[PDB]
Amino acid sequence: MDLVEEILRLKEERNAIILAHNYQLPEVQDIADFIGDSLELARRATRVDADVIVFAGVDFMAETAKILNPDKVVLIPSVEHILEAKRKYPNAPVVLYVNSTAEAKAYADVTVTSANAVEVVKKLDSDVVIFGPDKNLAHYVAKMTGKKIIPVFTLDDVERAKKLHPNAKLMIHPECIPEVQEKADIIASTGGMIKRACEWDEWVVFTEREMVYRLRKLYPQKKFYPAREDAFCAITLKNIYESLKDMKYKVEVPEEIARKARKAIERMLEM
């Protein structure tokens, strides 16, 4: 059958929109109504203009879209440590990376993505911030904001990369360990990488390999080398079709939890 044509018919029949993350397969990105990083996706999902959202991304972000649209259908194609940290730091605000459970977000004062972690944390009064669960992003934030660190790819790849592409600059994700972050020409979320790619003609990409295809698509003239070229490698176009055909893998979040996480996420967007 023709998957593209079937998905197009079902999108209309179900009154659905397809949102894709930057790491999705080219075939999935090609069928999406919008592609972006977590922040860009949260914004697009706000007050969504459809009855159904097919979210081609990780489970925790599909939950974010659901939390933001409690009365809409969200389909995905495929805790104690916080309270303890809070008891030791009663006045410190809790900042949770979107890469976390909805339940965890319920304990957060505000959430962050890789693109806005620095901005949001700098706007928090407290000089001490509880931040989790990604330790590497926590280090990046600590270094960029100068606040207290209340947490809750290797150098060989960098060298091999420089050896093969001497004139290429490096795009490194804040999720990479500190050592690598230090060697970066630019540190950014996938959304940031796309925005700043115009700053050079050749780039070595330190993030998921699928991002290379996204960048080549947006900048056909530039050269994008994956961090580990020789390394061999997911939601498929067929999964997208089946998702719409069977309305499956509905994403749900208990009201109590959802209400609290929603306050943290909507605050993130305002900040």
CSV table of C-alpha atoms in Angstrom, one decimal:
chain,number,residue,atom,x,y,z
A,1,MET,CA,0.0,0.0,0.0
A,2,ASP,CA,1.0,3.7,-0.2
A,3,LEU,CA,1.7,4.7,3.4
A,4,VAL,CA,2.0,8.4,2.6
A,5,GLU,CA,-1.4,8.6,1.0
A,6,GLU,CA,-2.9,6.4,3.7
A,7,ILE,CA,-1.5,8.6,6.5
A,8,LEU,CA,-2.7,11.7,4.7
A,9,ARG,CA,-6.3,10.4,4.5
A,10,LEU,CA,-6.2,9.3,8.2
A,11,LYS,CA,-4.8,12.7,9.3
A,12,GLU,CA,-8.0,14.2,7.9
A,13,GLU,CA,-10.3,11.5,9.1
A,14,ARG,CA,-8.9,11.7,12.7
A,15,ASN,CA,-8.3,15.4,12.5
A,16,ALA,CA,-4.7,14.9,13.6
A,17,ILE,CA,-1.4,16.7,13.4
A,18,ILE,CA,2.0,14.9,13.3
A,19,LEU,CA,4.8,16.5,15.4
A,20,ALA,CA,8.3,15.1,15.0
A,21,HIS,CA,11.5,15.5,17.0
A,22,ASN,CA,14.8,16.2,15.3
A,23,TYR,CA,16.1,12.7,16.0
A,24,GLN,CA,13.2,11.0,14.1
A,25,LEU,CA,13.9,9.0,10.9
A,26,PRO,CA,13.9,11.0,7.6
A,27,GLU,CA,10.7,9.1,6.5
A,28,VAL,CA,9.0,10.2,9.7
A,29,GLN,CA,10.2,13.8,9.5
A,30,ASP,CA,9.0,14.0,5.9
A,31,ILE,CA,5.4,13.2,6.9
A,32,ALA,CA,5.4,15.5,10.0
A,33,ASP,CA,3.4,18.8,10.1
A,34,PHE,CA,6.2,20.2,12.3
A,35,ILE,CA,9.7,19.2,13.3
A,36,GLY,CA,11.8,20.6,16.1
A,37,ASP,CA,13.5,20.2,19.5
A,38,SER,CA,11.6,19.8,22.8
A,39,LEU,CA,11.0,23.5,23.4
A,40,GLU,CA,9.8,24.1,19.9
A,41,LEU,CA,7.6,21.0,20.1
A,42,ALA,CA,6.1,22.1,23.4
A,43,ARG,CA,5.3,25.5,21.9
A,44,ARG,CA,3.7,24.0,18.8
A,45,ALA,CA,1.6,21.6,21.0
A,46,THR,CA,0.3,24.5,23.1
A,47,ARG,CA,-3.4,25.0,22.5
A,48,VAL,CA,-3.0,22.5,19.7
A,49,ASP,CA,-5.0,23.0,16.5
A,50,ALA,CA,-6.2,19.3,16.1
A,51,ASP,CA,-8.2,16.7,18.0
A,52,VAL,CA,-5.3,14.3,17.9
A,53,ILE,CA,-1.6,14.7,18.2
A,54,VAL,CA,0.6,11.9,16.8
A,55,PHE,CA,3.9,12.5,18.7
A,56,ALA,CA,6.9,11.1,17.0
A,57,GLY,CA,9.4,11.5,19.8
A,58,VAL,CA,10.4,10.1,23.2
A,59,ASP,CA,7.7,9.1,25.7
A,60,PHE,CA,8.3,11.9,28.2
A,61,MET,CA,7.8,14.6,25.5
A,62,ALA,CA,4.6,13.0,24.3
A,63,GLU,CA,3.5,13.2,27.9
A,64,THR,CA,4.4,16.9,27.9
A,65,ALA,CA,2.1,17.4,24.9
A,66,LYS,CA,-0.6,15.5,26.7
A,67,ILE,CA,-0.2,17.5,29.9
A,68,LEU,CA,-0.6,20.7,27.8
A,69,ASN,CA,-3.7,19.3,26.1
A,70,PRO,CA,-5.7,17.3,28.7
A,71,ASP,CA,-8.8,17.3,26.5
A,72,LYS,CA,-7.0,16.1,23.4
A,73,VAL,CA,-5.9,12.6,22.3
A,74,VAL,CA,-2.1,12.2,22.2
A,75,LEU,CA,-0.7,9.1,20.5
A,76,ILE,CA,2.9,7.8,20.6
A,77,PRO,CA,3.7,5.5,17.6
A,78,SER,CA,5.8,3.2,19.8
A,79,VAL,CA,10.9,10.6,43.2
A,80,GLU,CA,12.1,10.1,46.7
A,81,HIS,CA,15.5,11.5,45.8
A,82,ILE,CA,13.7,14.8,44.9
A,83,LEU,CA,11.9,15.2,48.2
A,84,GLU,CA,15.1,14.4,50.1
A,85,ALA,CA,17.1,17.0,48.1
A,86,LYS,CA,14.2,19.4,48.9
A,87,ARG,CA,14.4,18.7,52.6
A,88,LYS,CA,18.1,19.4,52.6
A,89,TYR,CA,17.5,22.5,50.6
A,90,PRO,CA,14.0,23.8,51.6
A,91,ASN,CA,14.4,27.2,49.8
A,92,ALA,CA,16.0,25.9,46.6
A,93,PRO,CA,13.7,25.8,43.6
A,94,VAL,CA,13.4,22.4,41.8
A,95,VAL,CA,14.3,22.4,38.1
A,96,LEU,CA,13.5,19.3,36.1
A,97,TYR,CA,14.7,18.5,32.6
A,98,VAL,CA,11.8,17.6,30.3
A,99,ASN,CA,13.6,14.2,29.9
A,100,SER,CA,11.8,12.9,33.0
A,101,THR,CA,8.5,11.3,34.1
A,102,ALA,CA,5.3,13.3,34.5
A,103,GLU,CA,5.3,12.2,38.1
A,104,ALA,CA,8.7,13.8,38.6
A,105,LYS,CA,7.5,17.0,36.9
A,106,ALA,CA,4.8,17.2,39.5
A,107,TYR,CA,7.5,17.9,42.1
A,108,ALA,CA,9.1,20.6,40.0
A,109,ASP,CA,8.7,24.3,40.3
A,110,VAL,CA,9.6,24.7,36.6
A,111,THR,CA,10.9,22.5,33.8
A,112,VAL,CA,13.6,23.1,31.2
A,113,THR,CA,14.8,21.7,27.9
A,114,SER,CA,18.4,21.9,26.5
A,115,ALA,CA,17.7,25.1,24.7
A,116,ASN,CA,16.4,27.1,27.7
A,117,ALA,CA,18.0,25.5,30.7
A,118,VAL,CA,20.5,28.4,31.1
A,119,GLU,CA,18.0,31.2,30.5
A,120,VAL,CA,15.4,29.8,32.9
A,121,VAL,CA,17.9,29.0,35.7
A,122,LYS,CA,19.5,32.5,35.4
A,123,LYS,CA,16.0,34.0,36.0
A,124,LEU,CA,15.6,32.0,39.3
A,125,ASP,CA,16.4,34.1,42.4
A,126,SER,CA,18.0,31.4,44.5
A,127,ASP,CA,21.7,30.9,44.1
A,128,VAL,CA,21.1,27.3,44.8
A,129,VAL,CA,19.0,25.2,42.5
A,130,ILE,CA,18.0,21.5,42.6
A,131,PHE,CA,18.4,20.3,39.0
A,132,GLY,CA,17.9,16.9,37.4
A,133,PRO,CA,18.0,14.3,36.2
A,134,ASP,CA,20.7,14.8,33.6
A,135,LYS,CA,24.1,15.3,35.3
A,136,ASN,CA,25.8,16.6,32.2
A,137,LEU,CA,23.2,19.3,31.5
A,138,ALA,CA,23.5,20.2,35.2
A,139,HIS,CA,27.2,20.8,34.7
A,140,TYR,CA,26.6,23.0,31.7
A,141,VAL,CA,24.1,25.1,33.5
A,142,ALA,CA,26.3,25.4,36.6
A,143,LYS,CA,29.1,26.6,34.4
A,144,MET,CA,27.0,29.1,32.5
A,145,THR,CA,25.0,30.5,35.4
A,146,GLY,CA,27.5,30.4,38.3
A,147,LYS,CA,25.0,29.0,40.7
A,148,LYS,CA,25.2,26.1,43.1
A,149,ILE,CA,25.0,22.6,41.6
A,150,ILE,CA,22.3,20.5,43.3
A,151,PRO,CA,22.0,17.5,41.1
A,152,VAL,CA,19.3,14.7,41.5
A,153,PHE,CA,31.1,10.5,23.1
A,154,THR,CA,34.6,10.8,24.5
A,155,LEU,CA,37.8,12.8,23.9
A,156,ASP,CA,38.9,10.0,21.5
A,157,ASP,CA,35.8,10.8,19.3
A,158,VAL,CA,36.7,14.5,19.4
A,159,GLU,CA,40.3,13.7,18.2
A,160,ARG,CA,39.4,11.2,15.5
A,161,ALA,CA,36.9,13.8,14.3
A,162,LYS,CA,39.5,16.6,14.2
A,163,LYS,CA,41.9,14.3,12.4
A,164,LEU,CA,39.5,13.5,9.6
A,165,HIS,CA,37.9,16.9,9.2
A,166,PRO,CA,40.5,19.5,10.3
A,167,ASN,CA,38.5,22.5,9.1
A,168,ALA,CA,35.1,21.4,10.5
A,169,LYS,CA,33.8,22.9,13.7
A,170,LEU,CA,32.0,20.9,16.4
A,171,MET,CA,28.4,21.0,17.4
A,172,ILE,CA,28.1,19.4,20.8
A,173,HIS,CA,24.9,18.7,22.7
A,174,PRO,CA,24.9,19.8,26.4
A,175,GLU,CA,24.1,16.2,27.3
A,176,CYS,CA,27.7,15.2,26.4
A,177,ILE,CA,30.2,14.9,29.3
A,178,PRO,CA,32.0,18.0,30.4
A,179,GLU,CA,35.4,17.1,28.8
A,180,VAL,CA,33.7,17.0,25.4
A,181,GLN,CA,31.6,20.1,26.0
A,182,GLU,CA,34.9,22.0,26.6
A,183,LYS,CA,36.1,21.1,23.1
A,184,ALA,CA,32.9,22.4,21.4
A,185,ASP,CA,32.7,25.2,19.0
A,186,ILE,CA,29.0,25.5,19.9
A,187,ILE,CA,27.0,23.8,22.6
A,188,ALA,CA,23.3,23.7,21.9
A,189,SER,CA,20.1,21.7,21.7
A,190,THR,CA,19.2,20.3,18.2
A,191,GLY,CA,17.1,23.4,17.7
A,192,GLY,CA,20.2,25.6,18.5
A,193,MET,CA,22.4,23.6,16.1
A,194,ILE,CA,19.9,24.2,13.3
A,195,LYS,CA,19.8,28.0,14.1
A,196,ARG,CA,23.6,28.3,14.3
A,197,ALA,CA,24.6,26.0,11.4
A,198,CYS,CA,24.9,29.1,9.2
A,199,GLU,CA,28.1,30.0,11.1
A,200,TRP,CA,30.3,27.5,9.2
A,201,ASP,CA,30.3,25.3,6.1
A,202,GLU,CA,31.5,22.1,7.7
A,203,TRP,CA,30.3,20.6,11.0
A,204,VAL,CA,31.0,17.5,13.0
A,205,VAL,CA,27.8,16.6,14.8
A,206,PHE,CA,28.0,15.3,18.4
A,207,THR,CA,24.4,14.0,18.9
A,208,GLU,CA,22.2,11.3,17.4
A,209,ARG,CA,23.0,10.3,13.8
A,210,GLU,CA,19.5,11.1,12.6
A,211,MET,CA,20.3,14.8,13.2
A,212,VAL,CA,22.9,14.7,10.4
A,213,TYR,CA,20.1,14.0,7.9
A,214,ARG,CA,17.9,16.8,9.4
A,215,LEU,CA,20.8,19.3,9.0
A,216,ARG,CA,21.7,18.2,5.4
A,217,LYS,CA,18.0,18.6,4.5
A,218,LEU,CA,18.0,22.2,5.8
A,219,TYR,CA,21.4,23.1,4.5
A,220,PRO,CA,22.1,21.0,1.3
A,221,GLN,CA,25.3,22.9,0.5
A,222,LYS,CA,27.0,22.3,3.8
A,223,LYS,CA,28.9,19.2,5.1
A,224,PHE,CA,27.7,17.4,8.2
A,225,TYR,CA,29.9,14.6,9.5
A,226,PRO,CA,28.6,12.4,12.3
A,227,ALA,CA,30.7,12.1,15.4
A,228,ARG,CA,31.2,8.4,15.0
A,229,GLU,CA,31.1,7.8,11.2
A,230,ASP,CA,32.1,4.1,11.3
A,231,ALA,CA,29.4,3.4,13.9
A,232,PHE,CA,26.4,1.4,12.7
A,233,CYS,CA,23.0,2.1,14.1
A,234,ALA,CA,13.0,3.4,15.9
A,235,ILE,CA,9.6,4.9,15.0
A,236,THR,CA,8.9,4.1,11.3
A,237,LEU,CA,6.5,5.4,8.7
A,238,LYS,CA,4.6,2.2,9.1
A,239,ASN,CA,4.2,2.9,12.9
A,240,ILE,CA,2.8,6.4,12.0
A,241,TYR,CA,0.2,4.7,9.8
A,242,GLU,CA,-0.7,2.1,12.4
A,243,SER,CA,-0.8,4.8,15.1
A,244,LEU,CA,-3.5,6.6,13.1
A,245,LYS,CA,-5.2,3.4,11.9
A,246,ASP,CA,-5.6,1.9,15.4
A,247,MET,CA,-5.5,5.1,17.4
A,248,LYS,CA,-2.9,3.4,19.6
A,249,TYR,CA,-0.5,4.0,22.4
A,250,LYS,CA,-2.7,6.7,23.8
A,251,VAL,CA,-0.8,8.8,26.2
A,252,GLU,CA,-2.5,9.5,29.6
A,253,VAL,CA,-1.5,11.3,32.7
A,254,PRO,CA,-3.5,11.2,36.0
A,255,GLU,CA,-5.2,14.5,36.7
A,256,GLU,CA,-3.5,15.2,40.0
A,257,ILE,CA,0.0,14.6,38.6
A,258,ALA,CA,-0.9,16.4,35.3
A,259,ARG,CA,-2.2,19.5,37.0
A,260,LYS,CA,1.1,20.0,38.9
A,261,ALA,CA,3.4,19.1,36.0
A,262,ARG,CA,1.4,21.5,33.9
A,263,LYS,CA,2.1,24.4,36.1
A,264,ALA,CA,5.9,23.7,35.9
A,265,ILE,CA,5.8,23.4,32.1
A,266,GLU,CA,3.6,26.4,31.4
A,267,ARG,CA,5.9,28.4,33.7
A,268,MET,CA,8.9,27.2,31.6
A,269,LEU,CA,7.2,28.5,28.5
A,270,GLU,CA,6.6,31.9,30.0
A,271,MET,CA,10.1,32.2,31.2
